[PDB]
A paper describes a structure:
DNA gyrase is the only type II topoisomerase capable of catalyzing DNA supercoiling, in a reaction driven by ATP hydrolysis. DNA gyrase consists of two subunits, GyrA and GyrB (97 kDa and 90 kDa, respectively, in Escherichia coli), forming an A2B2 complex in the active enzyme. The N-terminal domain of GyrB is the site of ATP hydrolysis, while DNA cleavage and strand passage occur at the interface between the C-terminal domain of GyrB and the N-terminal domain of GyrA.
Instead, two distinct homodimers can be generated from these monomers by the addition of crystallographic symmetry-related monomers. The aminocoumarin moiety is bound to the protein through hydrogen-bonding interactions with Lys42, His45, Arg91, and Ser172 and hydrophobic contacts with Val44. In order to accommodate SD8 in this new binding configuration, a single cis bond is required in the tetraene linker adjacent to the ester linkage with the olivose and is fully consistent with the observed electron density. The only significant change is that the N-terminal end of α-helix 3 partially unwinds (it becomes two residues shorter), allowing the protein main chain in this region to move in order to accommodate the polyketide moiety of one SD8 molecule and, in so doing, projects the side chain of Asp87 toward the symmetry-related SD8 molecule, such that it hydrogen bonds, via a water molecule, to the ester group connecting the tetraene linker to the olivose sugar.
Author numbering:
A (entry chain A), B (entry chain A): 33 to 174, 179 to 245, 259 to 282, 292 to 305, 315 to 425, 430 to 521
């Protein structure tokens, strides 16, 4: 019921986006019918059959609901007049490009996973988000009430915090002057913004921009129009190219109608598994600390993966340099178990890959009796099984070359990853550069006037 | 909305059972949560989110609903008193053993498949059922109304029809004297049974077996009890070990209460894509004709599959008999494309598999320039790619032996399949023997007294 402070998501949102990721329902592939994603979420992650899962998909696609849409939707996803989306069998969805940034590096052991409801699947506890989504898209529930914000502004605030962790709320507000609604309009109550940013709680007012061009966030246009007719105890000329409501009285309309509304900001989020009231700085610090954890864990993962792969490739290169005796050995083995034991029994000469093979690339788990030792290769059982799994086409010149090239590139990736892990400065710089690139790729203009 | 005469299923039932088959949710594996199957059905086959999919799962598991349950359910699936099943996240299901007979040989091109709703999946149009499910489990909908029947009886009727296609309705009724309800009780109206079997339509009456031990099919026990209290302008002592309702008056109760109900038999099913009223003989003939189509198509499929596999294995055996020159060829090939062209360029000597290799096993699509020709093997490109895909462990003695043994068994399977396809007598005998085995494995005692 409360969003996680780190990714801004509640469980239902996270389960939806996760299912889309697992489906490969990517920004650069064909749309899928909404029903497919709904069915996957219901069966694997959120085993309830009411309207919440599809409702969440629909909200995440509506440009009048989310400041940065997380779902790219095609078809009828409803309108600001409150009409419903078409049924899930008709609408088409895929991940928005920015949703890939929310889930960047999820496959790289960057976040803890928890059991799904039947213990057959894992689900991330939180997304390894590059986007400060809690602030930029906001959240509500009945309690928390966090308005959306401009991504450029929020990223600038994160970077200012990284530069000076003692930055004041006033300092942060030089970069983040207030909320930014997808529906634009006007905010009127600067003290309310400051009190929210300082304490977590502050009430602000949102005013429409007689011709009405923009209305407050979360106001239903058709209901607004009916409300005006009822108080009159007007035409809607809006279209695809923008909103246009046609109607002294204006101040009166602002006084008794949703042409002005209050927004009670109440920044409550899950923080270390507990609900907590959080100010602007708490929220930014939590996001930054999350980036530190993610990037560290990612770098460790990549280093491990690269060493593991390089280790398998060493075996393959040695076998392919010793192809005749390898074949002679396997052909005379009664069974695959005996071939594997014969492979590991006696070390192998390195041949023309000697220079290429001769500590940085050794997996940390590899005991000292294995690997290159005195110009000879001592294979593990796993390495022997990889030789036994080699297809005959890997003996052709090009496939042999590709393996050697892959090994060489891994050696360079490993040296680089060690330099990064070994340097707090490098690691912090990766974090910053990632934020800055997010700003360059996805940052847009402010819409709401403060 | 109407069941297919051949499998007795409506689309929703077929989509449920199909999803369970695709999931591998088999009788001899662990139960899965109902929600998983629901989610898969909704996402892939039946993209509507109301109660129908789960309701269908629940009905198929209830021993008071289906004469032969198609779902094996564990947990609370509701009762004859009309209480609801527990929610889908709590109940556990797998296919009943007999449901595997309903879908036997589905993977062997035995039935036509149709597009699912988004054109990303195939769904069978009908199941290749060994079970005459329309009769044994019945159907209803608002119209068709077909009561359930005893499997032993119905199979005996099918076999009697196969022996004499001119069998009369009276002849069939020597094997099938009437319906058989899962809830037992008593049928009172033999003319109604005969008129239904002769014409498709007949009305019959079902009577409870004061102590009530059995009640009519589709009667809710709790509602029956309330109905008796209302007319009285009694205790339920039923338990896990059987039904027991405790209450001259009896005849009166039979006259004004569901201790007796009418069942209007109306045997309407889909037949060649059209709704048709069908008599007993029409229904049996349709099932038998379906078995003829299935077994023919299955036999053709197996023959094709076996020839295809044998053809790939011939290439592998020849390569493994020529392992040195094969390796020399591939090692000196600049790329896998050049290795493949070199493999196919020149025919191969047969070596010690000559006797084993030397028309019955040739795929029907294989042009005469390929295969064994004058003691030499001419490879296709596909066969060359299979050699290139061979893992080094296939050179060990045991893996080499397993390949040769597989080829030998395929040769014998192919000779047998040709004998069957070539003989209407053999083919009809397979059909009969399959029915008889169904009767032996799944046949049980009559429950309802006529
Ligand atoms: C507290 C509560 O509501 O409990 C519900 C309970 C009463 O009912 C459960 C339920 C309903 C119906 C059925 C079921 C249920 O469990 C049987 O599971 C059932 O599915 C039912 C069936 O009908 C069957 O009968 C049925 O009828 C249909 C189907 C398909 C299946 C079934 O045959 C069988 C099955 O057993 C769902 C259950 O819901 C849950 O467990 C969890 C709900 C989570 C909702 C989160 C909503 C979030 C909204 C939200 O965040 N608003 C947002 C914002 O304000 C918001 C603001 C800013 C912003 O940026 C964002 Cl992104 C925002 O995003 C937002 O989403
Ligand atoms: C004619 C009709 O009823 O149309 C329905 C239409 C009115 O409503 C459709 C529908 C309902 C709800 C929703 C939807 C629908 O399309 C949105 O698809 C929706 O799912 C809805 C949502 O709530 C969402 O809002 C929602 O609220 C919940 C979820 C999870 C998804 C959504 O957020 C979004 C989604 O767009 C379903 C739609 O149903 C169908 O298309 C097909 C229904 C087939 C039913 C077959 C029942 C068979 C019973 C039967 O055979 N009885 C049996 C016997 O008597 C019987 C007798 C003997 C025997 O042996 C057997 Cl086996 C027997 O078996 C039997 O089954």
């Amino acid at each position: 019921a409360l969003p996680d402070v780190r990714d801004g998501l509640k469980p239902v949102h996270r389960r939806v986006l996760y299912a889309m990721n697992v489906l490969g329902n990517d920004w650069n592939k064909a749309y899928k019918k909404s029903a497919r994603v709904v069915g996957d979420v219901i069966g694997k992650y959120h085993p309830h059959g009411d309207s919440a899962v599809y409702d969440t998909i629909v909200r995440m696609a509506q440009p009048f609901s989310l400041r940065y849409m997380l779902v790219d939707g095609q078809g009828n996803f409803g309108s600001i007049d409150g009409d419903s989306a078409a049924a899930m069998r008709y609408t088409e969805i895929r991940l928005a490009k920015i949703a890939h940034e929310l889930m960047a590096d999820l496959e790289k052991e960057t976040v803890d996973f928890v059991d799904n409801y039947d213990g057959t699947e894992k689900i991330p506890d939180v997304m390894p988000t590059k986007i400060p989504n809690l602030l930029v898209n906001g959240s509500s529930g009945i309690a928390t009430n966090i308005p959306p914000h401009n991504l450029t502004e929020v990223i600038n605030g994160c970077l200012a915090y990284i530069d000076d962790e003692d930055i004041s709320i006033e300092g942060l507000m030089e970069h983040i002057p207030g909320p930014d609604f997808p529906t634009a309009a006007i905010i009127n109550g600067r003290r309310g913004i400051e009190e929210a940013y300082r304490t977590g709680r502050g009430k602000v007012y949102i005013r429409a921009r007689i011709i009405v061009h923009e209305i407050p966030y979360q106001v239903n246009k058709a209901r607004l129009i009916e409300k005006i007719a009822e108080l009159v105890k007007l035409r809607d000329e809006s279209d695809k190219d923008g909103m246009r409501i046609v109607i002294v009285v204006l101040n009166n309309l602002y006084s008794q109608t949703q042409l002005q509304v209050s927004f009670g900001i109440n920044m409550v989020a899950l923080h270390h598994g507990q609900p907590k009231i959080m100010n602007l700085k708490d929220i930014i610090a939590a996001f930054v600390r999350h980036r530190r954890e993610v990037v560290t864990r990612r770098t460790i993962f990549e280093l491990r993966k690269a060493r593991d792969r390089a280790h398998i490739l060493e075996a393959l290169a040695v076998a392919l340099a010793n192809i005749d005796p390898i074949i002679e050995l396997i052909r005379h083995a009664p069974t695959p178990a005996e071939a594997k034991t014969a492979l590991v029994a006696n070390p192998w000469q390195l041949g023309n890959v000697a220079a290429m093979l001769e500590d940085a690339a050794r997996p940390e788990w590899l005991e000292p009796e294995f690997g290159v030792r005195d110009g000879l290769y001592y294979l593990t059982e796993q390495q022997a099984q990889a030789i036994l799994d080699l297809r005959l086409q890997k003996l052709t010149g090009l496939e042999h070359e590709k393996l050697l090239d892959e090994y060489k590139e891994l050696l360079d990736q490993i040296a680089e990853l060690l330099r990064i892990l070994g340097s707090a400065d490098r690691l912090m710089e990766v974090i910053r550069e990632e934020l800055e690139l997010v700003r360059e790729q996805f940052g847009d203009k402010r819409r709401t006037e403060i």
